[model samples]
Target: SALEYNKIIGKGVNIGNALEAPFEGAWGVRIEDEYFEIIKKRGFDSVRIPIRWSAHISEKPPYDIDRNFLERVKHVVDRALENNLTVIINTHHFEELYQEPDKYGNVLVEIWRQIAKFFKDYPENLFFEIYNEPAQNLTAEKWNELYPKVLKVIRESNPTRIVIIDAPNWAHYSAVRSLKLVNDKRIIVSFHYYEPFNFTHQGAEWVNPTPPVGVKWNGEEWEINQIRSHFKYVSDWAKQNKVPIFLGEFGAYSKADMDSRVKWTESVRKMAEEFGFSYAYWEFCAGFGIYDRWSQNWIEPLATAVVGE
Candidate 1:
């Protein structure tokens, strides 16, 4: 079986599963390599790539994840490994509660069997993040209730690799806190932090404001605290429980000033390091991103969370 997930934990970057013509998915490896360089240059130890498996998988049990899609994903994973960085490949942008997870049925098993068969030959540096931010549900119990089965299937082929399991509510503090690991060591619990959602998600409409919050674009210390607390909350809990904490995603909006936003990011980085929690800044490109295909200046702090100047 894969070793417990808490070992060798460190900073990472989230590669949203939506790559396509615009971002250039399946076109070639340069896209993923660009990210590999970004990750290595920025000092990140790992890259978490989320791939939506539905589009490729049609039909019923053991649906196919299209040969092209699998090749593209593997191409990215291999690039990360070649770059000397740990890689996390996951089924993302999909709700685990309803589709990916089933207490008895083999929905998760079939998916893993296919994935495992594909990557079974890869090096140990690669990991399978079972699901990315499981949601489309209310309670963590409901989401995690099926983890054992899904995890079992994943372990069947890819044994002794690190595996990140996201909490419910698309990864929340409450969800992380309520989880029971059964003394599992190779399992690292992951969650996302975007507190005061109004600020981080100001212009972004896709996000559902479960309970709306406040204004943003300000770099004030107090405002930074509110965001930092989000990380601190989970960091403290993870420390107390001896579980590794990975912030699957977190970043201020791009609408804010570059410097101020960097300041805001610094706060998160500070709290994360202080509490021994690792994180991946939100994206590769979009409203919040470091990559500006137009400008091509990857140096921009598009979603950088590095602390200090």
Candidate 2:
């Protein structure tokens, strides 16, 4: 039944750049009940809420998360669940843990310990992702060392909770091949997809040296095959290990033309579904957003690509 939680997370969107912003509303957007309603109405099944727990907690030991902030998170989770949508919450942007793995390992453990205690009685539809995109100095070895510590804390309070874990190096699919398998049976491995990074992330500001403008994805057979091969590595691992996988994030930037973006999105979505993997788009509103927050309308082409009319 825990493995079946993968289907519960099928076809979803991430509420990124909002709660994950450095501060609530810092990114010029805030979570609203109406947003959950919109996601459910769009035929999506889940919402992955990325919260920077480190931002709301104290810098010193004990690292207690702010009560008001935790309550706000609960409120958003309630809104999504009230809409009959499965909800996922993760410790995102906890850069310190990744940077100083050994030193902050205890801090990471404490953060999840408190979180687990807070949501200990939460319904099964609510899932927890241990952390997002372990990268930079947070190499695979360190992640392996740190994850079970965090996971053990979670299990102390909630034994059967469905936890999500990502591969090292920004959760890249190729890295999934080397991702370590933990002893827990209720975990789902996740990775982010933005293949042909030149195409999907073209002109993305955060990318170093910034990918050049005007890179295009034409969805040629060669390109499509590459997508298949990349995903197969993860799928093969899942099949062998008998664990489920989630494509936690993937999307082309707004700078890319709509036609190319739609094709790329459709290709990835189809392949992921074909592999029997659950997935959530890179984000709901922000650089790679499908919904236009200002216009308050779904970007017709992209939305249609993800969830047909």
Candidate 3:
């Protein structure tokens, strides 16, 4: 089932730095209805909406998510669906769970429970990604144990719905080998690719002791081979496990040389396709974005690399 759904999720992009920001618009980008139309017209079949549910939930027992926030998220989801794009809505930036899983595990489950219940009647194309980039104190072992709890709650109200699971350690492909997923054909395994991190994140201020600018990905033989081998390994893993794979996020940031950025993005995108993986570029508009929100335009060859000419 996941394999079937993965095909429908082909050629996607993430709407990052929007709802997933501490607050909508706090990160200098906000979701707009027309963005969905643009994505569809530009040849993307899906869009992943990353939302920071943790930021809107109550701190007390039952942990109700703010109603207005939920509604706003739904509006965005609806817009994407109406434009004929399959959608993924994930719990992104759950900082507390990453740092103190023991303290916040139940809250994380409750958040999914509410989300699952609220969208139970939504279209099947609206997939649920249990969580994004589990890292820090949420070790691979803890993540293996925790996500099933969230999935169980989600299943209570949304059985048969396709659910996506991110590999731990920031959804790195290397960590995919550590995943211990339960037998569920309806599930997809996802990982983020920003390999040669220095090249992709160069000058990214948010990264601690930020990587310097001027790092370039020239699509050299070794650089291309590195990506090829990594995807090959992940593909082998997926074949052995009989699980579908989704390249949840991959892109080079704005500070890098434009030519290098395009080379890197195109290389990664091609590798994912060759390995039979559905992918979403890291973002639509922001630092690593392929689109420029202010200019209201796709950012040239970078956008073309992911979505084609």
Candidate 4:
């Protein structure tokens, strides 16, 4: 069933830097109603909305999510669904969980419990992603134990809803080897790709000692094979486990040369298609964005690479 659902999630884009920013629009992007229309008309069938629930929830027991925030998230989700796009809402940037897994672990469960109940009535196209990029103290072992707790709570209200879980270590491809999920037919295994990190993240200010600019990805033979090798490993794992794969995020930052970014994006998108994996590009209108929010335009080359002409 999860494998079947992956087809519906085909060719998507992430609406990053919006709800996931500590405050909406703090990172210079806000979720706008028009975004859904643009994404749909651009040929993407889905949109993944990353939300930082940690920034908007209670600090104590019951751990209620802010009502206004929940409403805001719902509004975005509704807009995407209304445009006939499958929507994925994930708990992202829960920095505390990474540093103090034992302390915030239960809080993570409670967070999902509330979210599951709140969106229980939504249609199946609205999927719940357990967490995004579990890392640091949230080790593979801890994540293996942590996600099921959240899944169990989610199942309480949304039994058949598809749930996506990322591998630890920033959802890297290799980390998928360490994931231990429960026997749930509705689960989709997802991983983020930014390989040749030096190239993709070059000039990314947020990265420590920001990788210098001028690095390039020229679609060299070895470069393409490197990606192929990685995806082959993931596809092998997916087949062995009988789980579907989702390329949840991948893109080159704006600092890279446009030609290199286009080449890399098209190669990665094609590789995902060859492996029969569904994918959502890293973002819509931000650093690694396909659409330009201010100009209300698609970065034609990159957008075409991700969604085709």
Candidate 5:
């Protein structure tokens, strides 16, 4: 039976930078526990744990999936569930798959084949996103036409789970229009929304690299109109395709300022609320960190702000 999923608007964060934080002697740390607690207190109903198997896997075929690593991953997943939060896991930084398509595709399947065997019996609240923003020359045709096969392997072990698949073009709104939706009733579609880039990526030194050069989603009434326009296009297509949508990752960085981002996220929340879409912010700790433990006093409000008080 398919998991009866809920439409929950919440906050999240990637676990990479911490699990592998740059420091000394593999330094002892236990932030994820504190992190999830804050997220729960702030009213985030779910947490998305993005893991990088390549960080530990040392070989091909079986790819090592090491018992210790799997245990560590489970430690975090179980922690979230213990806190009573929905947990979504996936192959986060397997960038090589995006580069060596033919080889990596099979390699990826093997990895998940192991993953499926491990977590198959978990509750439906345990979700999986096939790949992070499939990269490396994956054209729209390839993304739509060929990529569903990865999801198929996952089904072999997790036949009735809520697996999310993102469209090509880096999870953009326009990409949703061109991409194809897989023909399956048990899956929920995912999309990451950070429109205009200007607002969402402030101080994102690596990508946009700075505050936006111009502002389009400024706190305004007309901005909601624009959001509705895209909603009409994407959700209409989804309805026609017989798919449910999840606004997987959406949030402007803290650099975007509290008032502006809250207004912007509120606009987003209102639309998602009206449209019956569930969502989780791109982060819980930093960048858009609303629950940073280190910076708790000032940041806790950010996550709480999204949850209304």
Candidate 6:
């Protein structure tokens, strides 16, 4: 059952910016086999591969994801599975569909159609995530409308494959409440957490005008409770809906001092576990990464905080 599989997913990490990069090296790094071994050795039980399928696919109908690109993704997925890790692969950064849900809705479904067929024979550990952080013009209503179509497309060939769905408004905590329940039992709902956003995302380049620096998460009881209470929305919704949930992404950005990042990371990880949800840290070796790319070393203490040495 999907619920049993959720327990196995346990603690996970996202291999961000590798396959999701606009181009292979756009993010200045590619995933390495050693990286996969490092994640397994560090105690993570799962890996979520976020791929920008739109970048590889044709704009026209039957949006064909590039064969080479698909194979590259499969190679990584295979490596993770070979290491005995649960794997989640998803359509990420489909900005065209995000900005124009209705216009590209079918295109989005088309992308999943090909992806599902491509991996139809995969083992149960290889999961399909419908989309990451559905937002922009992909409103809650629109996401609700669009996701079922994608799920149906996947089901056409790969029935019972545990599929993940994100809440609207960028998988925000509160956003999960309004998400309509699908009829399928083989599903896990997901949300991204960067609460006390100023603290977690301080100095993120993606912000309109970057947030001021020196704002810190001291991880006081109140701050910790904020994480707990915010997550209650997700846990409560899952209880009511009778579906498993995943914290698909959460981490403090690199600009924050290490102590603050670890405090926040530990609290979020612990709280999500307390509420019985599995999670993937925001990323591995990127901006909000657990791995320091330039230093070429795992942020040891932070990594320990996540997987708990």
Cα RMSD (Å) per model? 3.9, 1.1, 0.9, 0.8, 3.3, 1.1
lDDT per residue for candidate 4 within 1-309, as digits (tens), equals 788899999999999989999999999898889989988998999999999999998888989999999999989998999999999999999999989999999998999999999999999999999999999899999999999999999999999999999989999999999999799999999999999999999999998989999998999999999999999999999999999999999999999999999999999999999999999998899888888767879998889999974
lDDT of 1 by residue, 1-309 (tens): 232343344666666525422234442223546768866876777777767665566566567667887887778778888888888777654443355344323555577779987898888768777776666552567555667667777778876666777877768766777776645667777887776566667656556643233444465778767656766777677777777877777776676557756766667766766766767777665556666657865645543455223
Select the stronger candidate by TM-score from 3 and 5. 3
Determine which window of 10 residues in candidate 1 has minimal summed lDDT. 20-29
What's model 4's overall lDDT?
0.94
Question: How many residue pairs clash per model?
Answer: 9, 0, 0, 0, 3, 0
Question: What TM value does model 1 have?
Answer: 0.83
TM-score of 4: 0.99
TM-scores for all candidates: the values are 0.83, 0.97, 0.98, 0.99, 0.87, 0.97
Displacement of residue 200 (Cα, Å) in model 6 is 1.0
Across residues 1-309, which tens digit of lDDT does each residue of candidate 5 receive? 232474532444444344433321132334456666766775678877767766676575677687898898888888888888888887765666666666666667777878888999998788887776765666566667445776788888888888877766777767777777777777777777887577788677758357763343566767878888777777888777767777777787766767777778877766765776667776655557555555564363455445653
The list of candidate 3 runs beyond 4 A from truth reads: none
Candidate 5: regions farther than 4 A off: 1-16, 19-31, 208-217, 295-301
Question: lDDT per model, in order?
Answer: 0.66, 0.89, 0.93, 0.94, 0.69, 0.88
Model 5, position 3, has a per-residue lDDT of 21
lDDT of 5 at 80: 85
lDDT ranking, best first: 4, 3, 2, 6, 5, 1
Report the lDDT tens digits of candidate 2 across residue range 1-309: 545899999999999888877897887668988999999998999999999888999877798899999999999999999999999999888877767878877887898999899999989999999999999888998888889888988999999999999989999999887777888889999999999899998888888989988988888999999999999988998899899999999999999988899999999999999899899998797877889978989987888777653
Worst 10 residues of 2 by lDDT: 300-309
Higher-TM-score candidate of 5 and 6: 6
- What is residue 309's positional error in candidate 1, in angstroms? 8.3
